[PDB]
């Protein structure tokens, strides 16, 4: 059921708007379990309620945020939560211009689950599924990505990350990404209405990390991909910025928006500034709003 | 196992070819072909007639090195000498231009040799299965050149059989190849691509869009340059389209040049008509098409 020019228009508008000016993506979709340690770390208990609380706070921050955040991904749960005044978390973000994202993380029930998701205000989906192996999750992605685009969703293709050297990690990422896109072509996936969520070729200063990241990236990632928001993963809010800055500085061809799709580097500080106490929204919305702008500048190199 | 040392080279050469709106001349016509050419100007096919015409081209003013950054050559020709016993090979080396040989098991041996002779880049052109073998051959040879310090001009394929049709095909055939080159770990930065142009009536606008689209869907931003082949197009159209493609409002991380033959020698060969009296005229039309296309490569070209 190949896309019609119209479906592309829609897809394109979205993927492009999730990075429109350097606006990265927020990883506010952690699992019931993950959120648990996150909140746990701050010397607090993991409970459904206390979630809607740290999430209502973030999505409530000044509207200026839509200058650093182009879209936010949510766990199933949050996509339905109502803020204090019974306001849908969904709409608190939509109104302010941010785009609704949904963790779709088996391709069974996806062409159905997505169809619904779109109706429920979601415009893009996240999902992460040896030569044999490498080709597997690839054809997989390819299908899942082809599915989202059928239900007006914008696939954020995530190529799984797998003690060696940078040069090593670089060769693997390259070898992988090549299979990812090759497969994706095989499945006639509108690259324009897509988005890549790769890892930073890391173990080595940010420049060296960005020089080995972009390189491997430009040798593999097609110009037609509107943007590539990185995943912080184990990088301090201060290193997920340094690196993403150098990346947007590395002296090489870079036809795609070199954005971010952070969670630990966008919440951490704003996560401590809460600690259960729901009156210090300032400290919270302070530590969150401080990183969204900063890492919005990493996506510009003006950092 | 390319060393950061040869990559250095492979690239310098890869880029020096497509520097500033500069393209490649394909004077590599194989005997039989070259005769078909001369035959159109009613000129007998002789080892000499060939040697002369091509002598005229390569003998054109050195300012020809502002439009032509590299010339390909056919076996025979790599060893012929101009009227004064001088070598086209070196006539071109000294004249700025880089010399390129046409290569088409024993390959890697030949290369090192053609490298010793002054050639710094070569060429070799070839169903789901089909395209795969093509892709992979084009990749073995690719790494064989870089092994022997040459810059592999990857040439894909396609059949004359609308626009969106030739496009969709081009993108497949092009993914097979850059994927191929990856499985074989080909230093993409020491490469060059000679794609066809994705081409119901069509304006350079479209013919260029359909094309650049497909190109930025498949060909990596690491490839330093895409030198389109004009096969079939008039010298004029090869230019309108190379210009068009160069102005297309799309992303283009790579130089979009020309690696023309018919499009560059066409007129320059008809004005000579095999009469050594017109060496003058000939060199004009060449120089003319030579600069003309460079402009198209800068998108800076105007038809009147």
Swiss-Prot record, chain A:
Effect of residue 295 to K: In HFI; frequent mutation
UniProt-listed SUPFAM superfamilies: Aldolase
CDD domains on file: FBP_aldolase_I_a
Catalyzed reaction equations: beta-D-fructose 1,6-bisphosphate = D-glyceraldehyde 3-phosphate + dihydroxyacetone phosphate; beta-D-fructose 1-phosphate = D-glyceraldehyde + dihydroxyacetone phosphate
Pathway note: Carbohydrate degradation; glycolysis; D-glyceraldehyde 3-phosphate and glycerone phosphate from D-glucose: step 4/4; Carbohydrate biosynthesis; gluconeogenesis; Carbohydrate metabolism; fructose metabolism
Modified positions (Phosphoserine) in chain numbering: 31, 84, 111, 232, 236, 259, 261, 269
Primary enzyme class: lyase
Subcellular localization, as worded in the UniProt entry: Cytoplasm, Cytosol; Cytoplasm, Cytoskeleton, Microtubule organizing center, Centrosome, Centriolar satellite
Effect of residue 303 to H: In HFI; almost no effect on enzymatic activity at 30 degrees Celsius, but reduced activity at higher temperatures
Outcome recorded upon mutating residue 41 to W: In HFI; reduced enzymatic activity
Oligomeric form and interacting partners: Homotetramer. Interacts with BBS1, BBS2, BBS4 and BBS7. Forms a ternary complex with G6PD and TP53; this interaction is direct.
Disease involvement: Hereditary fructose intolerance: Autosomal recessive disease that results in an inability to metabolize fructose and related sugars. Complete exclusion of fructose results in dramatic recovery; however, if not treated properly, HFI subjects suffer episodes of hypoglycemia, general ill condition, and risk of death the remainder of life.
Name of the protein this chain belongs to: Fructose-bisphosphate aldolase B
Protein encoded by which gene: ALDOB
